[PDB]
Amino acid sequence: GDELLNICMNAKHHKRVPSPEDKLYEECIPWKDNACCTLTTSWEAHLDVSPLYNFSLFHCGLLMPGCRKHFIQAICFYECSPNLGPWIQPVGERVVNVPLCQEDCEEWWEDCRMSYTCKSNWRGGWDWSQGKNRCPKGAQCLPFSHYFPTPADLCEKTWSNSFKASPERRNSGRCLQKWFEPAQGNPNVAVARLFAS
Numbered sequence: 001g002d003e004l005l006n007i008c009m010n011a012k013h014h015k016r017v018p019s020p021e022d023k024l025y026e027e028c029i030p031w032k033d034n035a036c037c038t039l040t041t042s043w044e045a046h047l048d049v050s051p052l053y054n055f056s057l058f059h060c061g062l063l064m065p066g067c068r069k070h071f072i073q074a075i076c077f078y079e080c081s082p083n084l085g086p087w088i089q090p091v092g093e094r095v096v097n098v099p100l101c102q103e104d105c106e107e108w109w110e111d112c113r114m115s116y117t118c119k120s121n122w123r124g125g126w127d128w129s130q131g132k133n134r135c136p137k138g139a140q141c142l143p144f145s146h147y148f149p150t151p152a153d154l155c156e157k158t159w160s161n162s163f164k165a166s167p168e169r170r171n172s173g174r175c176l177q178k179w180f181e182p183a184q185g186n187p188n189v190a191v192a193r194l195f196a197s
Protein backbone atom coordinates (compact mmCIF):
# COMPACT_ATOMS: atom_id res chain seq x y z
CA GLY A 1 0.00 0.00 0.00
CA ASP A 2 2.49 2.63 -1.19
CA GLU A 3 2.97 4.78 -4.30
CA LEU A 4 6.45 3.40 -5.04
CA LEU A 5 5.23 -0.20 -5.44
CA ASN A 6 4.37 -1.73 -8.82
CA ILE A 7 5.20 1.29 -10.93
CA CYS A 8 7.23 1.78 -14.09
CA MET A 9 9.63 4.66 -14.62
CA ASN A 10 8.73 7.42 -17.10
CA ALA A 11 11.17 6.37 -19.80
CA LYS A 12 10.93 5.92 -23.57
CA HIS A 13 9.51 2.40 -23.98
CA HIS A 14 8.39 1.59 -20.45
CA LYS A 15 4.77 0.61 -20.16
CA ARG A 16 2.86 3.16 -18.11
CA VAL A 17 1.68 0.55 -15.56
CA PRO A 18 3.08 -2.99 -15.12
CA SER A 19 1.09 -5.97 -16.35
CA PRO A 20 1.68 -9.57 -17.41
CA GLU A 21 3.32 -10.37 -20.74
CA ASP A 22 2.47 -13.84 -22.09
CA LYS A 23 5.61 -13.76 -24.28
CA LEU A 24 8.95 -12.18 -23.45
CA TYR A 25 12.15 -13.24 -25.21
CA GLU A 26 14.80 -15.27 -23.43
CA GLU A 27 16.62 -13.19 -20.83
CA CYS A 28 13.44 -11.20 -20.05
CA ILE A 29 11.37 -14.25 -19.11
CA PRO A 30 11.67 -13.81 -15.30
CA TRP A 31 9.39 -10.75 -15.54
CA LYS A 32 6.59 -12.42 -17.56
CA ASP A 33 4.16 -12.34 -14.61
CA ASN A 34 4.35 -8.56 -14.31
CA ALA A 35 6.50 -6.48 -16.62
CA CYS A 36 7.25 -2.81 -17.39
CA CYS A 37 8.60 -3.97 -20.77
CA THR A 38 6.65 -4.81 -23.91
CA LEU A 39 7.29 -7.81 -26.14
CA THR A 40 9.20 -5.70 -28.65
CA THR A 41 11.36 -4.28 -25.86
CA SER A 42 12.33 -7.83 -24.91
CA TRP A 43 13.12 -8.50 -28.58
CA GLU A 44 15.25 -5.38 -29.07
CA ALA A 45 17.14 -6.21 -25.87
CA HIS A 46 18.46 -9.30 -27.68
CA LEU A 47 19.51 -7.68 -30.95
CA ASP A 48 23.18 -7.57 -31.88
CA VAL A 49 23.29 -3.82 -31.22
CA SER A 50 20.09 -2.84 -29.45
CA PRO A 51 18.12 0.23 -30.59
CA LEU A 52 16.99 0.70 -27.01
CA TYR A 53 20.07 2.94 -26.60
CA ASN A 54 22.14 2.39 -29.84
CA PHE A 55 24.99 1.43 -27.54
CA SER A 56 27.23 -1.27 -28.98
CA LEU A 57 28.54 -3.74 -26.43
CA PHE A 58 30.97 -4.82 -29.19
CA HIS A 59 32.87 -1.50 -29.40
CA CYS A 60 36.09 -3.52 -28.81
CA GLY A 61 35.01 -6.56 -30.86
CA LEU A 62 35.99 -9.20 -28.29
CA LEU A 63 32.76 -9.78 -26.31
CA MET A 64 32.16 -13.33 -25.18
CA PRO A 65 28.63 -14.80 -25.00
CA GLY A 66 28.56 -15.18 -21.20
CA CYS A 67 29.49 -11.51 -20.86
CA ARG A 68 26.81 -10.32 -23.29
CA LYS A 69 24.28 -12.55 -21.50
CA HIS A 70 24.74 -10.54 -18.27
CA PHE A 71 24.30 -7.28 -20.19
CA ILE A 72 21.08 -8.44 -21.86
CA GLN A 73 19.86 -9.53 -18.44
CA ALA A 74 20.66 -6.05 -17.07
CA ILE A 75 18.71 -4.41 -19.94
CA CYS A 76 15.73 -6.68 -19.20
CA PHE A 77 15.88 -5.81 -15.50
CA TYR A 78 16.09 -2.07 -16.19
CA GLU A 79 13.28 -2.23 -18.79
CA CYS A 80 10.96 -4.83 -17.19
CA SER A 81 11.21 -4.71 -13.39
CA PRO A 82 8.08 -3.36 -11.65
CA ASN A 83 10.10 -3.24 -8.40
CA LEU A 84 12.42 -0.24 -8.97
CA GLY A 85 10.05 2.45 -7.71
CA PRO A 86 12.04 3.38 -4.61
CA TRP A 87 14.96 4.28 -6.93
CA ILE A 88 13.06 6.18 -9.64
CA GLN A 89 14.49 9.69 -9.94
CA PRO A 90 14.11 12.70 -12.25
CA VAL A 91 16.86 12.59 -14.87
CA GLY A 92 12.11 12.25 -17.81
CA GLU A 93 12.79 9.53 -15.24
CA ARG A 94 15.52 7.01 -14.53
CA VAL A 95 16.73 4.85 -11.65
CA VAL A 96 19.69 5.62 -9.39
CA ASN A 97 21.60 3.28 -7.08
CA VAL A 98 19.42 0.19 -7.30
CA PRO A 99 21.20 -2.16 -4.79
CA LEU A 100 22.28 -5.27 -6.69
CA CYS A 101 23.32 -8.26 -4.59
CA GLN A 102 26.98 -9.21 -4.37
CA GLU A 103 26.64 -12.38 -6.45
CA ASP A 104 25.02 -10.55 -9.39
CA CYS A 105 27.97 -8.19 -9.74
CA GLU A 106 30.52 -10.88 -8.88
CA GLU A 107 29.23 -13.34 -11.50
CA TRP A 108 28.88 -10.49 -14.01
CA TRP A 109 32.50 -9.48 -13.39
CA GLU A 110 33.86 -13.03 -13.67
CA ASP A 111 32.02 -13.82 -16.88
CA CYS A 112 33.26 -10.63 -18.53
CA ARG A 113 36.83 -10.84 -17.19
CA MET A 114 38.25 -11.83 -20.61
CA SER A 115 36.09 -9.63 -22.87
CA TYR A 116 37.45 -6.27 -24.09
CA THR A 117 36.41 -2.65 -23.54
CA CYS A 118 38.16 0.70 -23.96
CA LYS A 119 36.65 2.84 -21.18
CA SER A 120 36.28 2.54 -17.39
CA ASN A 121 33.19 4.75 -17.35
CA TRP A 122 30.71 4.14 -20.12
CA ARG A 123 28.86 7.43 -19.54
CA GLY A 124 30.13 9.87 -22.16
CA GLY A 125 33.34 10.19 -24.13
CA TRP A 126 32.16 7.94 -26.94
CA ASP A 127 32.65 8.70 -30.61
CA TRP A 128 29.22 8.57 -32.33
CA SER A 129 30.51 10.34 -35.45
CA GLN A 130 29.36 7.58 -37.79
CA GLY A 131 26.27 6.33 -36.02
CA LYS A 132 27.23 3.66 -33.49
CA ASN A 133 29.49 4.32 -30.50
CA ARG A 134 33.23 3.85 -31.13
CA CYS A 135 36.23 4.09 -28.82
CA PRO A 136 37.76 7.59 -28.69
CA LYS A 137 41.35 8.40 -29.58
CA GLY A 138 43.73 7.20 -26.88
CA ALA A 139 41.34 4.63 -25.39
CA GLN A 140 42.94 1.29 -26.20
CA CYS A 141 40.93 -1.96 -26.00
CA LEU A 142 42.02 -4.02 -23.01
CA PRO A 143 40.32 -6.73 -20.93
CA PHE A 144 37.35 -5.72 -18.80
CA SER A 145 39.46 -6.60 -15.76
CA HIS A 146 41.69 -3.63 -16.68
CA TYR A 147 39.00 -0.95 -17.04
CA PHE A 148 36.68 -2.52 -14.41
CA PRO A 149 39.07 -3.59 -11.63
CA THR A 150 36.35 -4.81 -9.26
CA PRO A 151 32.80 -6.10 -9.62
CA ALA A 152 31.58 -2.83 -8.13
CA ASP A 153 33.16 -0.82 -10.94
CA LEU A 154 31.45 -2.96 -13.60
CA CYS A 155 28.04 -2.82 -11.91
CA GLU A 156 28.19 0.88 -11.15
CA LYS A 157 30.15 2.48 -14.00
CA THR A 158 28.48 0.66 -16.93
CA TRP A 159 24.99 2.07 -16.37
CA SER A 160 25.89 5.55 -15.04
CA ASN A 161 25.05 4.68 -11.44
CA SER A 162 21.63 3.19 -12.22
CA PHE A 163 23.07 0.32 -10.21
CA LYS A 164 24.80 0.16 -6.83
CA ALA A 165 27.03 -2.77 -5.94
CA SER A 166 25.49 -3.85 -2.64
CA PRO A 167 27.75 -5.57 -0.07
CA GLU A 168 24.76 -7.77 0.78
CA ARG A 169 24.47 -11.30 -0.56
CA ARG A 170 21.48 -12.83 -2.34
CA ASN A 171 18.73 -14.00 0.01
CA SER A 172 19.75 -11.27 2.47
CA GLY A 173 16.41 -9.53 2.05
CA ARG A 174 18.24 -6.26 1.40
CA CYS A 175 19.39 -6.26 -2.25
CA LEU A 176 17.97 -6.98 -5.69
CA GLN A 177 18.97 -9.48 -8.37
CA LYS A 178 19.22 -8.38 -11.99
CA TRP A 179 18.16 -11.91 -13.00
CA PHE A 180 16.64 -14.93 -11.29
CA GLU A 181 15.21 -18.32 -12.22
CA PRO A 182 11.58 -17.93 -13.40
CA ALA A 183 10.41 -21.01 -11.47
CA GLN A 184 11.43 -20.05 -7.89
CA GLY A 185 9.58 -16.72 -7.73
CA ASN A 186 10.66 -13.12 -7.73
CA PRO A 187 13.16 -12.25 -4.96
CA ASN A 188 12.95 -8.51 -5.56
CA VAL A 189 9.31 -7.81 -4.59
CA ALA A 190 9.82 -8.06 -0.83
CA VAL A 191 12.98 -5.94 -0.97
CA ALA A 192 11.21 -3.23 -2.93
CA ARG A 193 8.42 -3.33 -0.38
CA LEU A 194 10.92 -2.74 2.45
CA PHE A 195 12.51 0.25 0.69
CA ALA A 196 9.11 1.80 -0.13
CA SER A 197 8.14 1.75 3.60
Ligand SMILES: *[C@@H]1O[C@H](CO)[C@@H](O)[C@H](O)[C@H]1NC(C)=O
Pocket: 051, 052, 053, 054, 131
Ligand atom coordinates in the same frame (compact mmCIF):
# COMPACT_ATOMS: atom_id res chain seq x y z
C1 LIG B 1 19.51 5.53 -32.59
O1 LIG B 1 18.88 5.04 -31.50
C2 LIG B 1 17.71 5.74 -31.12
C3 LIG B 1 17.28 5.08 -29.83
O2 LIG B 1 17.27 5.98 -28.74
C4 LIG B 1 16.67 5.66 -32.24
O3 LIG B 1 15.67 6.62 -31.95
C5 LIG B 1 17.28 5.96 -33.61
O4 LIG B 1 16.39 5.56 -34.65
C6 LIG B 1 18.64 5.28 -33.82
N1 LIG B 1 19.26 5.82 -35.03
C7 LIG B 1 20.17 5.22 -35.80
C8 LIG B 1 20.64 3.86 -35.35
O5 LIG B 1 20.62 5.76 -36.81
Ligand SMILES: [Cl-]
Pocket: 081, 082, 083, 186, 188, 189
Ligand atom coordinates in the same frame (compact mmCIF):
# COMPACT_ATOMS: atom_id res chain seq x y z
CL1 LIG C 1 12.43 -7.26 -10.24
